[PDB]
Amino acid sequence: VLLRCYTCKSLPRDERCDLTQDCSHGQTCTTLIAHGNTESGLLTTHSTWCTDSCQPITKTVEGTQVTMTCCQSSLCNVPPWQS
């Protein structure tokens, strides 16, 4: 079964992904979410793409919450605040 995922780069919290790409066979949907303070105050971003190796993780790199999520449904990789 071939998947279609949302493919967007570093989008701000209040903005939904328009771009969608057909994944290569074996590929899964992924979402990276960064959340931490910046010069323009606190900021939440989301990036989505077709990945090969998918590892769900949640680490706080240099005081920024990074969350990685995987899903096997088509167009499923939508950030929590948009599902």
């Binding site: 780069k9 570093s10 992924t30 990276l32 960064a34 931490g36 910046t38 010069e39 323009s40 900021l43 971003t45 990036s47 793409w49 990945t51 090969d52 190796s53 590892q55 993780i57 680490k59 790199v61 240099e62 920024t64 990074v66």
Partner: protein, 442 residues
């Protein structure tokens, strides 16, 4: 029988997994009973360790280390140490001459094993260091059938650089010839290690000129003045490193160092050669992929100063965007990599030129296994005492994305600024970028 072999000056010890440092048992050419006395395993493969030049006439410290590692990796094999210490203890050009005779001694011994015991030559691996790499080459060029493999460990350069294929190690000498070039510093024909490729695969660790932890860096060198000389040459550190890199590969079967095919060391040091497509990469050492190409393929990599020598290579591409046209020369930066497993902060690197709306590629390597990359911090360094002040005017660039290609995992990763643009300003706070894309190159 023995009568037809007494002219053979070279001795052949069958060293054991428990007796590594001594030539206890000898395999006497023409005396078939000596093979049983030594307990040669006719079922297993054979390694022939051929030493090089010596001013002392004693086996160096590396000989038991190499024997021990071959027996750790291959516990049932036969590890034969070739003794040519008398001939290897003459004035260099004279011992260089004796490589023909040692090559002949070895070939006759190999051919005898085959004739007398019908031992397969496809089960023979020749490891030659210094002049021994050429003694191995000559031996291989004189056997009845071709030997399986020849490893050249920093082959002797003086009087061999311009020697023709029959007088030195060359790819026709075995089924597969792999060569580590670790001390090629100097003019052609005047380097201690041979500069030209002489195998099917020719690996040049750290460009092959000298090894990390072996030289006296240019700064220390200038300060020391008339005092210090070429300690590396004298101590044979860089030269010998090829033996330690090989040993490392035998002790780390599961994690080999990867070498990358490249047009030049200068191109490699720009991070332009990091692919694995059409055998453009290979494993350094024992676990090499026996790819015999049409042309001699030169391969590069970086290593640590000490065992285990493996480092992770990354190519980093940055487009330096800006509003006003400015050009900066010999600029120093620091890059910090944050992954899933670990991190390596403040990795320095410099760029010869930094100019508005231009892209620059560079190599970044690290000992740390950081895992999958998540974050990237970039700092543009200043040495001015006023850089801290907001009153101090400093140049800057707007950087949106940073493209990274990891050599070991063959992955292209895009990192992009948290805000619309990250301002990289000389002497100020670091610009932050977070992963926004992955791509397995396969």
């Amino acid at each position: 029988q023995r009568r037809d072999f007494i002219d053979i000056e070279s001795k052949f010890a069958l060293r054991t997994p428990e007796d590594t440092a001594e030539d206890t048992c000898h395999l006497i050419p023409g005396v078939a009973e000596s093979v049983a006395t030594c307990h040669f395993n006719h079922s297993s493969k054979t390694f022939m360790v051929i030493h090089g030049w010596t001013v002392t006439g004693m086996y160096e410290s590396w000989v038991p280390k190499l024997v021990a590692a071959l027996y750790k990796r291959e516990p049932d094999s036969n590890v034969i140490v070739v003794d040519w210490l008398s001939r290897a203890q003459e004035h260099y050009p004279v011992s260089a001459g004796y490589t023909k005779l040692v090559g002949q001694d070895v070939a006759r011994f190999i051919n005898w094993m085959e004739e007398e015991f019908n031992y397969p030559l496809d089960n023979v691996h020749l490891l030659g260091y210094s002049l021994g790499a050429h003694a191995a080459g000559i031996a291989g060029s004189l056997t009845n059938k071709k030997v399986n493999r020849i490893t050249g460990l920093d082959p002797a350069g003086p009087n061999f650089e311009y020697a023709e294929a029959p007088s030195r190690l060359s790819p026709d000498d075995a089924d597969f010839v792999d060569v580590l070039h670790t001390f090629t510093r100097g003019s052609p024909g005047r380097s201690i290690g041979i500069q030209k490729p002489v195998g099917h695969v020719d690996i040049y660790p750290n460009g092959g000129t000298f090894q990390p932890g072996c030289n006296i860096g240019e700064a220390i060198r200038v300060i020391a003045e008339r005092g210090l000389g070429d300690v590396d040459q004298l101590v044979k550190c860089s030269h010998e490193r090829s033996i330690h890199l090989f040993i490392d590969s035998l002790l780390n079967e599961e994690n080999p160092s990867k070498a990358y095919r490249c047009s030049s060391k200068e191109a490699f040091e720009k991070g332009l050669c990091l692919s694995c497509r059409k055998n453009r990469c290979n494993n350094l050492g024992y676990e090499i992929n026996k790819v015999r190409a049409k042309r001699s393929s030169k391969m590069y990599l970086k290593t640590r100063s000490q065992m285990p020598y493996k480092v992770f290579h990354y190519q980093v591409k940055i487009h330096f965007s800006g509003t006003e046209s400015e050009t900066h020369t010999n600029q120093a930066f620091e890059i910090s990599l944050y992954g899933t497993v670990a991190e390596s902060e403040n990795i320095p690197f410099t760029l010869p030129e930094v100019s508005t709306n231009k892209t620059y590629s560079f190599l970044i390597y690290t000992e740390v296994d950081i895992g999958e990359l998540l974050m990237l911090k970039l700092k543009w360094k200043s040495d001015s005492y006023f850089s801290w002040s907001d009153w101090w005017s400093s140049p800057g660039f707007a950087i949106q994305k940073i493209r990274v290609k990891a050599g070991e995992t063959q992955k292209k990763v895009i990192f992009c600024s948290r805000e619309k643009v990250s301002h990289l300003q000389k002497g100020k706070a670091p610009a932050v970028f977070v992963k926004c894309h992955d791509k397995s190159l396969n």
